[PDB]
Amino acid sequence: AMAGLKYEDAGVNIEAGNQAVERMKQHVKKTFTQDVLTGLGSFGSLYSLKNIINNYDDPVLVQSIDGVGTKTKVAVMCGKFENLGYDLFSAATNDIVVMGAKPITFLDYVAHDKLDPAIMEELVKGMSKACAECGVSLVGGETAEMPGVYQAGEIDMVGVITGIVDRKRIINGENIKEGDIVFGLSSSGLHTNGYSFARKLFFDVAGNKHTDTYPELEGKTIGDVLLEPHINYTNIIHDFLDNGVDIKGMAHITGGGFIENIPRVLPQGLGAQIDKDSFATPAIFKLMQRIGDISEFEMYRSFNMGIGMTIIASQDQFDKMQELAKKHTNTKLYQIGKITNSGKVEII
Amino acid sequence: QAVERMKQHVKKTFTQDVLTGLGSFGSLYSLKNIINNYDDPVLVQSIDGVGTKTKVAVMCGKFENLGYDLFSAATNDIVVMGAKPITFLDYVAHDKLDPAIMEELVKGMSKACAECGVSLVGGETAEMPGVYQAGEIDMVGVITGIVDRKRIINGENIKEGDIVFGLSSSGLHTNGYSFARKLFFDVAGNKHTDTYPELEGKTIGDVLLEPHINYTNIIHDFLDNGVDIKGMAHITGGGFIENIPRVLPQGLGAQIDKDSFATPAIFKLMQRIGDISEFEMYRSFNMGIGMTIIASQDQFDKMQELAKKHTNTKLYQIGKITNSGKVEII
Hints:
homodimer; alpha+beta; CATH 3.30.1330.10; 6-stranded mixed sheet; 4-stranded mixed sheet; 23% strand; globular
């Protein structure tokens, strides 16, 4: 154009939609193993079973579907999305590793009041990295934009993990006996449960904003502490199993804490006793207990209270476990309790 | 009690390959028979939601067909490559959980699973009050299936002169409900119990809520019985023009004869009320065809013979593959 004139398009720099798509594709592709083949659509892949059939005597397909839950609402209010991909991935895959399954594929669905490609880019970055850390291929996904369904700015994240375990290696708790030990691996916080409650506690009743802190938090913001990611126990559990640790049973500690989650893996009539003083409780829990005037018993009935995964094995497995655990810096191993004849899970 | 009825619906989906899982509703799936019956098995998966149809279901208070919708929405997307569905999992999120509703959804999903041999191996519900608008829900489902490597159908062998066949839909299926809801209930100020001349006394709610048809059985009947299918396209949002090109080799196009198949009344109604050109209709809606199948003309005879037993859909010859590079309606 001739000199001395306004640029017509000045101030509008709007990147072609295909740019974000391509970046997401690059992140997803980083998750692919040799077993992946071209799938359907932009993000679709398939998965060859050839290697699985060769490496397993009697392979069984193990699957689980899970959402993040109201933690997303906290992420939205904080404008902090970078840990949610990890939250979702862990929420789903910890639920199959309790059986000794090796995760193979992942798919995700994210629904939005309004789909914002920048936010989606961050979720895909996180989910892809989470997958890549444990050797899982992200083979497909879907999005939905439904402002009439969702409250303003809200989202819902759902994911599905698929894994393989040899039939004879399924860890079911059948061999658990009185006198076996309960071990546990620390959580980072609330993980993926109890956020509706926490949000109301802090932001409704207490009147906080997410950038506030409390003495328990040593300057860390409530938002940052709440948004720490759900720990993925896949790698440490497989380190144990690959090194010959004889794991009799496991329980992923989610809503309802020890009492709700442990009984699932116990043979008829057997109990468990968990010593609550044998492990550290994350500051966020102690803080909620104080601010919300919640009784200690309700807290332990409700929340993981610092243990995200339990492992049941004989005492003589502890040395090998603790040796192996040292290298995994995202979680800590404790001996927290024991299997009894009590017919109940109790916290003491 | 409601949980026991749900467990019974879920159990009805179990094939011999199912093993006990984790939790009330969890199961596992043994691959032994897969490994024995396939040369080179490939695991094929897809995840999808029902979409905005849920809002109409909530408005009508009719959940009978929604669980079936969810299964079909997920499963049809993998049958286009020749995969045989094996397992299903579902996730339902609610503003406020109502167990009577959940039972109805589980009833529908299980029916769809059971009739095609898919085992429902797990699921989850979530109540998230600060997330959903009053009474609203979201439903997600994931299908897993198996295909032999050599038998993957991608459309790569499609050529000019191949025929486009289609299988009838029941209605909008799973797409276009945002438009439908706004057309009928925002603007025309209708209630879901209202009717229109095109509907002959059937309510707008009932016609909208007819279930997304499950094409699993007819497609595998075609495939297992010797129909040489070069490609398929599930007609979902974007109608023929958006969906068909995805399976067409570069430069190829399709011509669809609009008069060759019946269009359900609901589409004619929306066309009139919205004053939408016929041109626009075929670009935005399935217009009566939920699935397209591309094969040579000489496959029609076997297809028609095999289709007879399948009473939930009708087979039509709707068009042909061209060199136009575009999808055109004539």
